Tab-separated table of C-alpha atoms in Angstrom:
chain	number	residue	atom	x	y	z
A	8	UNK	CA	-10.369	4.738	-5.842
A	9	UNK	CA	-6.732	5.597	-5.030
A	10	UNK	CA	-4.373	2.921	-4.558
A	11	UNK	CA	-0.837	4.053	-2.621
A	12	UNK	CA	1.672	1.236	-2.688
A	13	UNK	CA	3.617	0.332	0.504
A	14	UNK	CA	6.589	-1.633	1.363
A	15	UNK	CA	6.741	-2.832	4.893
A	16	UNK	CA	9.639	-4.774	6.360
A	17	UNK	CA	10.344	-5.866	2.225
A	18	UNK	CA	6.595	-6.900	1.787
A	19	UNK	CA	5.762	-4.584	-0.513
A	20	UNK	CA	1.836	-4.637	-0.994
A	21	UNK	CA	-0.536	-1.593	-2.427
A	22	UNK	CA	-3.725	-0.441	-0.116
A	23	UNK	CA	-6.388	1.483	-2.134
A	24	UNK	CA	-8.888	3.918	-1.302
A	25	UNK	CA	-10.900	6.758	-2.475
């Protein structure tokens, strides 16, 4: 129910959990 945000390689996208 989380959601962390990531940027890979400039692709920047946010994964949730919890």
């Amino acid at each position: 129910g989380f959601c962390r945000c990531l940027c890979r390689r400039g692709d920047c996208r946010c994964i949730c959990t919890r």
